Amino acid sequence: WQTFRRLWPTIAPFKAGLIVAGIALILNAASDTFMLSLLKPLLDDGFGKTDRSVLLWMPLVVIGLMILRGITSYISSYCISWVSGKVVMTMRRRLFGHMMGMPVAFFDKQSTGTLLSRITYDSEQVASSSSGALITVVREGASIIGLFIMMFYYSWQLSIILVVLAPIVSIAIRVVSKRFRSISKNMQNTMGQVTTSAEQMLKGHKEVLIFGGQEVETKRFDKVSNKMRLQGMKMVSASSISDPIIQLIASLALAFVLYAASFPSVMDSLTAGTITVVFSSMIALMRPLKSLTNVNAQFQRGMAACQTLFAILDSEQEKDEGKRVIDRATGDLEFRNVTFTYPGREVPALRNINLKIPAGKTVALVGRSGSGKSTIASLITRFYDIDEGHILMDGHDLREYTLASLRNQVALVSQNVHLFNDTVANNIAYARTEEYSREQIEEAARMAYAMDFINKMDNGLDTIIGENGVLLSGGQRQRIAIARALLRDSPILILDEATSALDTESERAIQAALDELQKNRTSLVIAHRLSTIEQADEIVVVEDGIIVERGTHSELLAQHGVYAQLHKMQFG
Amino acid sequence: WQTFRRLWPTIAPFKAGLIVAGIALILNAASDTFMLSLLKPLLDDGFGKTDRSVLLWMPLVVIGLMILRGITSYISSYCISWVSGKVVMTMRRRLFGHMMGMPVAFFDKQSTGTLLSRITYDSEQVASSSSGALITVVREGASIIGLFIMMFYYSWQLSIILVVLAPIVSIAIRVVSKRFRSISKNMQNTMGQVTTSAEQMLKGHKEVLIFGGQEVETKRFDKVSNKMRLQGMKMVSASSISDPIIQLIASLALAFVLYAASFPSVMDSLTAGTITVVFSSMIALMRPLKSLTNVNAQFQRGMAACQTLFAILDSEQEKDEGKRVIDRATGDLEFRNVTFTYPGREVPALRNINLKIPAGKTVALVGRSGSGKSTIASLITRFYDIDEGHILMDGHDLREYTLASLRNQVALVSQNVHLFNDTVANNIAYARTEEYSREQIEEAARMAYAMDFINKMDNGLDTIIGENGVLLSGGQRQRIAIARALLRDSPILILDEATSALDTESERAIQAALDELQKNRTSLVIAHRLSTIEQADEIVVVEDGIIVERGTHSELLAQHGVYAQLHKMQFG
Ligand SMILES: Nc1ncnc2c1ncn2[C@@H]1O[C@H](COP(=O)(O)OP(=O)(O)NP(=O)(O)O)[C@@H](O)[C@H]1O
Ligand SMILES: Nc1ncnc2c1ncn2[C@@H]1O[C@H](COP(=O)(O)OP(=O)(O)NP(=O)(O)O)[C@@H](O)[C@H]1O
């Protein structure tokens, strides 16, 4: 029940395997009563049954076994492997999704590696536990149930020995079990870190070469790798001494039987009938119990694992939700005295900031490399659901709106763009339906000045791109990121320094293209190369987390207030 | 021997565990002969030995067992878990390193996820195999050796049955074994892909939200996850039917004994002495063999795994090597008619390109967003060890030089910069020795216009940065990447569009800083914002994979050849 219990819910839909495998167990039990009912007799009494028994019962061994034994063995493996494989893969399925249901700074804090690990490794653990362990915890479990209810009344004297050591083996084992849950848990995170250190290794290849520390890396790894072999070794050894100690408690109630057989049987009451069955039943029961211990380890490993990720899944959906779902979008972006800071208790990266970007209009964000530009940029699309103030899209605040469509009401080109490992078409197509017309993309790639090189590379939009635009120019990439963002075609379009690395001529080319389209929609462009703002409906000069000037390329320039300054630095 | 064999080398240094665990096995065997030499007698003959036997031999059961049994159980677990834990973690250790010993487009082609996976998952497999399997393949293995040499001469008649089914069970099993090696192998890659799809998930979070396809992702995952539960299930079921089929061959030679016991024993020669021991020995031998099968599975899983990564490690060190190791570096970069293309058979991204950058001089790379700029940039530091031509640092070609110091002869600021998850200090410090003076960095961060914001954020250089500069501005990051690259202080410095996203004023600030330092060293700056080139010792205008103009801001401008064009587009 309880934690264990809370896991049965996800196993429930798969219980058909549990039962079918338990029924397979039973049938092999029957196959044993018959295999005993032929093997021992033809043993010594062999030349005593050499005719009728011998001959006529040979084809019943091959059939008794093949049929029952064989088909039942494959009934067990059959339904057991199945019940686990599904609960495991269905487990990791549930996390994956929950993971991305973790909006915000979650992904900011911990290394992606630890998360990645959780899916892979943690799920696998809880898997083995559910299947093979439930089968034996109920098998050797029911074996212990029969032997204790047997010695119970059948020999109330020796059962007064079981009621002195049963609670002692049970308590000593409950404890070793908690250190099992724990040692495995830590064993997990460790495995997780092995991952992280491995990701960095690869992700940072370029660096690591000129870096001048490939070995500094080797070192970091050896330390983590090792902390793994020893993390686990820690548990395995803890489990090894765990067995012989329980043998002690077993060999204790059993030796107690020998002490009461020297005096109490020499007082009858035990005789050669009970000093045979109560003792044989003792030396027997200690075996299935001293097996349930060795497998308990594995059951814990997984159980503990369940609870780790049971919890990670029980975490909080950083995806707060509103209600109002809109399909239309006149991009009437508006937000007042919105103040903002990142992980809670620190110093605001954006103070009392008021601003309105009416539909069709183009508002720009320029300021010192460090003012909340990119911040507010991403803050529009709720990535941080605010600090204190009001941000509303058409009179309605982001919250009033459903995160879902809200984010469907905007296209973006993040300062540094991230891409996938598909085809050009796709990296653009993976932009809402993931399947539009070959036209839209053809067009988008063109109205993004890129159809020329797309076509230069064989396979065109069908060409495989570098994992995160690795096998091609950043400009090319950026353009493509602009492509994607342009094709989607939203009412509110944010281009966070979308020019970043561009052939000046090519740049201005897009600029023209932009003007042509953005002429209707609401556009919020935030770049540094002023050249692409001189003709914006309004420019928001912002420094040190706070806005300082709203004006036309003209007003600003004339005003000589830090914008002008930058427009001076413009050249020289 | 062979593949299996080739793995023993890495297990060798750990064989002390193998032997100590085998000696522990033996000792438990002796503990069994004595446990039989007390348990059966006190069984029925209990009230027949109720005094001397009973009493005086009880403390020898508790000691016989505790001592031998207990200490031997912990001797087995002890040395076995150890031998594996080391061979596994030492395995993944060897790959990790080899992995980064894979210079070039390796990391370009396949998803980092697959590699990451290999370490984690593949190593674990070969681990279990080595330990638990070698123990039982030699245990149940030697058990089969004794039973076959026994029935051998002891009953040459029934041994003429073993020499009819032994080769049949052996061949049927050798085959199931190959499908074990295979099904596990594919099972691996699958697990690998589960990883990749999971990485993308997280890495692409930002996207995936505005993306508008969180569920498209869910779908991709379910398909891979599932392909996993079924990949493995495929093997497990294949193993399940594998057992009952071998039971068939066993139940075959055994039933043959019953057929020759009805007529041949009824011809003596077998009688009730041999129709008891040869048959008992038969029904016995089929058990340890029908166990070696079930564990063989696990042994294969790992064996196959060894060979997968045995090979991945046996791959080619894309790190070709030279000989000449230099410590000094007057940055005399020089290279003629060097042509270059990427993955072999395609169209050159750099043609006959000749260029010399003499020590102290500053050569710039500008051209259309698509010309081999970043390419040659990275080509200097050998990342692609060339196509056809000559690139030499001080008369000596890159090859003549040792990759090692060669890359130590240069500092770089890649178009898009990659960072780690340490402290500011470190992301800069991880730049050769990984431990310099607090000054150098203080200075580097300053002479990189960044000490101001570094100090604005609490903990300063001791502050924890975002996994790959996530929790701070790209400008800030870029500057830091410049920091790192600046502190190292090399003779040849390449700044690939190092300004990318910078506060114009801040930009020019660095520019000044650059001039001050680069005044002595050899500097190759390749940007787009021309403003930071107007005063370069020479500007290399390059378009469509080929150079087209070498001249001063002046000559070029005056010449009116595509450079001027760009310098016109400069504004407007
Ligand atoms: N995750 C974070 N945690 C704390 N502070 C942050 C975080 N992200 C950004 N900041 C702060 O916000 C500013 C950087 O972000 P932002 O203002 O969005 O950059 P940006 O406008 O793109 N600047 P730049 O890239 O230099 O043009 C600085 O004041 C940072 O200290
Ligand atoms: N790994 C690669 N495999 C194949 N082609 C590549 C690869 N990397 C770059 N290219 C080609 O080389 C050019 C892009 O690289 P490069 O010329 O270095 O960019 P760049 O000069 O930095 N351009 P930009 O970033 O736009 O200023 C294009 O013609 C690409 O198709």
- Transcribe A301-359 into DSSP letters: HHHHHHHHHHHHHHS--S-----B--S-----EEEEEEEE-SSSSS--SEEEEEEEE-T
CB contact burial A436-459 (16+ within 10 A = b; e otherwise):
beeebbbebbebbbbbebbeebee
Which residues between 295 and 354 in chain B have a beta carbon less than 8 angstroms from any beta carbon of chain A? 342, 346
CB contact burial B78-96 (16+ within 10 A = b; e otherwise):
bbbbbbbbbbbbbbbbebb
Q: How many CB atoms lie within 10 A of CB A548?
A: 15
Length of chain B: 572
Residues B515 and B495 sit within 8 Å (Cβ to Cβ)? no
Longest dimension (CA), chain B: 121
Q: Which of A205, A416, A457, A472 to mutate to test the pocket of ligand 2 (most atoms within 8 A of CB)?
A: A472
CA angle A415, A418, A419 (to 5 degrees): 140
Nearest to B404 by CA among B323, B330, B486, B485: B323
DSSP annotation of A460 reads G
């460090």: which residue's tokens? A370
Nearest to B536 by CA among B338, B361, B360, B276: B361
Stretch(es) of chain A classified as CATH 3.40.50.300: 323-572
**Three-class secondary structure of residue A474 per DSSP:** helix
Residues B393 and B400 sit within 8 Å (Cβ to Cβ)? no
Nearest to A488 by CA among A414, A417, A410, A416: A410
Residues A472 and A466 sit within 8 Å (Cβ to Cβ)? yes
Provide the pairing of β-strand B362-367 with B522-526. Answer: parallel
DSSP annotation of A423 reads B
Structure tokens given for A560: 């000589």
Q: How far is CA A145 from CA A140, A504, B524, in A?
A: 9, 82, 80
- φ, ψ (nearest 5 deg) of residue B525: -105, 135
CB contact under 8 A, B209 and A71: no
CB contact burial A23-55 (16+ within 10 A = b; e otherwise):
ebbebbeebeeebeebeeebeeebbebbeebbb
Beta bridge partners of B353: B338
One-letter amino acid identity for A187? Answer: M
CB contact under 8 A, A236 and B69: no
A92 and chain B: CB distance < 8 Å anywhere? yes
CATH class given for the domain over A323-572: alpha beta
Beta bridge partners of B355: B335
CA angle B237, B241, B244 (to 5 degrees): 145
Edge-to-edge strand list for the sheet holding B546-551: B410-413, B492-496, B522-526, B362-367, B538-543, B546-551
């996530």: which residue's tokens? B470
Residues 6+ apart with CB under 8 A from B181: B300, B303, B304, B307
Q: What does the alpha-carbon distance between residue A165 and residue A170 come to, in Å, rounded to a whole number? A: 8
3-state SS string over A475-499?
HHHHHHHHHHHHHHCCCEEEEECCC
CA angle A456, A458, A463 (to 5 degrees): 110
Q: Smallest Cβ distance to A212: which of B408, B414, B502?
A: B408
- φ, ψ (nearest 5 deg) of residue A352: -55, 95
Nearest to B106 by CA among B307, B312, B318: B318
Q: What does the alpha-carbon distance between residue B105 and residue B384 come to, in Å, rounded to a whole number? A: 8
Centroid of chain to Cα B400: 30
State the number of CA atoms in the 13 A half-sphere of B175 facing the CB. 8
Edge-to-edge strand list for the sheet holding A538-543: A410-413, A492-496, A522-526, A362-367, A538-543, A546-551
- The shortest C-alpha distance from B142 to chain A (Å) reads 24
């991009």: which residue's tokens? A331
Q: How was it solved?
A: X-ray
State the number of CA atoms in the 13 A half-sphere of B312 facing the CB. 25
CB contact burial A305-336 (16+ within 10 A = b; e otherwise):
bbbbbbebbeeeeebeebeeebeebbbbbbbe
Q: Is B240 annotated as a binding residue?
A: no
Nearest to B510 by CA among B538, B488, B481: B481
Structure tokens given for B123: 């190593």
Q: How far is CA A244 from CA A236, B131, B470, in A?
A: 14, 21, 52
- DSSP H or E stretch at residue B571: none
Residues 6+ apart with CB under 8 A from B108: A466, A467, A470, A471
Nearest to A150 by CA among A292, A283, A281: A281
- DSSP H or E stretch at residue B459: none
Q: Is the dihedral of CA A441, A442, A443, A446 positive or negative?
A: positive
Q: What does the alpha-carbon distance between residue A226 and residue A220 come to, in Å, rounded to a whole number? A: 10
Q: Is B367 annotated as a binding residue?
A: yes
Q: What does the alpha-carbon distance between residue B269 and residue B552 come to, in Å, rounded to a whole number? A: 109
DSSP annotation of A129 reads I
- The shortest C-alpha distance from A78 to chain B (Å) reads 6
Q: What does the alpha-carbon distance between residue B204 and residue B92 come to, in Å, rounded to a whole number? A: 27
Q: What does the alpha-carbon distance between residue B381 and residue B497 come to, in Å, rounded to a whole number? A: 16
Edge-to-edge strand list for the sheet holding A388-393: A350-357, A333-340, A388-393, A396-397
Q: What does the alpha-carbon distance between residue A245 and residue B74 come to, in Å, rounded to a whole number? A: 10
B94 and chain A: CB distance < 8 Å anywhere? no
Q: What does the alpha-carbon distance between residue B530 and residue B570 come to, in Å, rounded to a whole number? A: 8
Q: Smallest Cβ distance to A244: which of B70, B89, B407?
A: B70
Strand boundaries in B219-307, DSSP class E: none
**Three-class secondary structure of residue B155 per DSSP:** coil
- The shortest C-alpha distance from A553 to chain B (Å) reads 13
């005295």: which residue's tokens? A337
B371 C-alpha vs ligand 2 centroid, how far in Å? 7
Q: How many CB atoms lie within 10 A of CB B105?
A: 16
Q: Which of B106, B375, B381 to mutate to test the pocket of ligand 2 (most atoms within 8 A of CB)?
A: B375
Nearest to B53 by CA among A282, A247, A261: A261
Q: How many CB atoms lie within 10 A of CB A569?
A: 17
Residues B335 and B355 sit within 8 Å (Cβ to Cβ)? yes
Contact residues of ligand 2, CB 6 A cut-off: A 457, 471-476, 501; B 108, 342, 349, 369-375, 415
B20 and chain A: CB distance < 8 Å anywhere? no
- Determine which residue's CA is closest to atom 17 belonging to ligand 2: B372
- Transcribe B368-411 into DSSP letters: -TTSSHHHHHHHHTTTT--SEEEEEETTEETTTB-HHHHHHTEE
B473 and chain A: CB distance < 8 Å anywhere? yes
- DSSP H or E stretch at residue A175: helix A159-203
What is the distance in angstroms between the CA of the first residue and the CA of the last residue of chain A? 75
- φ, ψ (nearest 5 deg) of residue A347: -120, 125
Provide the pairing of β-strand B350-357 with A492-496. Answer: unpaired
**Three-class secondary structure of residue B268 per DSSP:** coil
H-only helix segments in A447-562: 451-456, 474-488, 504-518, 553-559
Beta bridge partners of A350: A340
Structure tokens given for B209: 């939200």
Q: Is the dihedral of CA B425, B427, B431, B434 positive or negative?
A: positive
Q: What does the alpha-carbon distance between residue A430 and residue A465 come to, in Å, rounded to a whole number? A: 13
Provide the pairing of β-strand B388-393 with B333-340. Answer: antiparallel
Q: What does the alpha-carbon distance between residue A108 and residue A95 come to, in Å, rounded to a whole number? A: 18
- φ, ψ (nearest 5 deg) of residue B569: -50, -25
Nearest to B435 by CA among A403, A459, A212: A212
- φ, ψ (nearest 5 deg) of residue A390: -140, 125
- Determine which residue's CA is closest to atom 24 belonging to ligand 1: A369
Structure tokens given for B361: 């001089």
């007799």: which residue's tokens? A41
Nearest to A477 by CA among A457, A501, A496, A461: A501
User: Which of the residues A44, A72, A96 would you substitute to probe the B interface, choosing the one with the greatest number of B C-beta atoms within 10 Å?
Assistant: A96
Q: What does the alpha-carbon distance between residue B271 and residue B144 come to, in Å, rounded to a whole number? A: 25
Structure tokens given for A464: 């495989």
Q: In angstroms, what is the C-alpha Rg of chain A?
A: 36
CB contact under 8 A, A261 and B221: no
Residues A357 and A550 sit within 8 Å (Cβ to Cβ)? no
- φ, ψ (nearest 5 deg) of residue B391: -120, 115
Beta bridge partners of B423: B464
Q: What does the alpha-carbon distance between residue A430 and residue B200 come to, in Å, rounded to a whole number? A: 13
| Total H helices, total E strands in chain B | 23, 10
B28 and chain A: CB distance < 8 Å anywhere? no
Q: What does the alpha-carbon distance between residue A222 and residue A225 come to, in Å, rounded to a whole number? A: 5
| Total H helices, total E strands in chain A | 23, 10
B562 and chain A: CB distance < 8 Å anywhere? no
Beta bridge partners of A365: A540
CB contact burial B484-495 (16+ within 10 A = b; e otherwise):
bbbbbebbbbbb
CB contact burial B253-270 (16+ within 10 A = b; e otherwise):
bbbbbbebbbebbbeeeb
Residues B247 and A65 sit within 8 Å (Cβ to Cβ)? yes
- DSSP H or E stretch at residue B572: none
A528 and chain B: CB distance < 8 Å anywhere? yes
Beta bridge partners of B494: B412, B524
Q: What does the alpha-carbon distance between residue B390 and residue B401 come to, in Å, rounded to a whole number? A: 13
**Three-class secondary structure of residue B314 per DSSP:** helix
**Three-class secondary structure of residue B458 per DSSP:** coil
3-state SS string over B505-569?
HHHHHHHHHHHHHHCCCEEEEECCCHHHCCCCCEEEEEECCEEEEEECHHHHHHHCCCHHHHHHH
- The shortest C-alpha distance from A219 to chain B (Å) reads 10
- Determine which residue's CA is closest to atom 17 belonging to ligand 1: A372
A220 and chain B: CB distance < 8 Å anywhere? no
Nearest to B237 by CA among A510, A79, A501, A218: A79
Residues B361 and B536 sit within 8 Å (Cβ to Cβ)? no
Structure tokens given for B376: 């040659």
- Determine which residue's CA is closest to atom 26 belonging to ligand 1: A369
State the number of CA atoms in the 13 A half-sphere of A416 facing the CB. 19
Residues A114 and A192 sit within 8 Å (Cβ to Cβ)? yes
**Three-class secondary structure of residue A410 per DSSP:** strand
CA torsion, ordered B96, B100, B106, B108, to nearest 10 deg: 100
Q: What does the alpha-carbon distance between residue B389 and residue A556 come to, in Å, rounded to a whole number? A: 53
Residues B233 and A83 sit within 8 Å (Cβ to Cβ)? no
Q: What does the alpha-carbon distance between residue B8 and residue B504 come to, in Å, rounded to a whole number? A: 62
Q: How far is CA A472 from CA A69, A412, B543, in A?
A: 61, 21, 15
Length of chain A: 572
What is the distance in angstroms between the CA of the first residue and the CA of the last residue of chain B? 75
B204 contact residues in A (CB cutoff 8 A): 418, 420
CB contact under 8 A, A370 and B96: no
Q: What does the alpha-carbon distance between residue B417 and residue A207 come to, in Å, rounded to a whole number? A: 9
**Three-class secondary structure of residue A92 per DSSP:** helix
- Nearest ligand to the CA of A107 is 1
**Three-class secondary structure of residue B300 per DSSP:** helix
Nearest to A199 by CA among A101, A90, A92, A120: A120
A344 C-alpha vs ligand 1 centroid, how far in Å? 15
A374 and chain B: CB distance < 8 Å anywhere? yes
Q: What does the alpha-carbon distance between residue B534 and residue B564 come to, in Å, rounded to a whole number? A: 12
Beta bridge partners of B551: B539
One-letter amino acid identity for B45? Answer: D
Nearest atom within ligand 1 for CA of residue A369: 26
Nearest to A7 by CA among A134, A187, A139: A134
Helix B134-154 with B15-39: angle, nearest 10 deg: 60
Nearest to B481 by CA among B500, B462, B464: B500
Q: Smallest Cβ distance to B112: which of A199, A211, A381?
A: A199
**Three-class secondary structure of residue B289 per DSSP:** helix
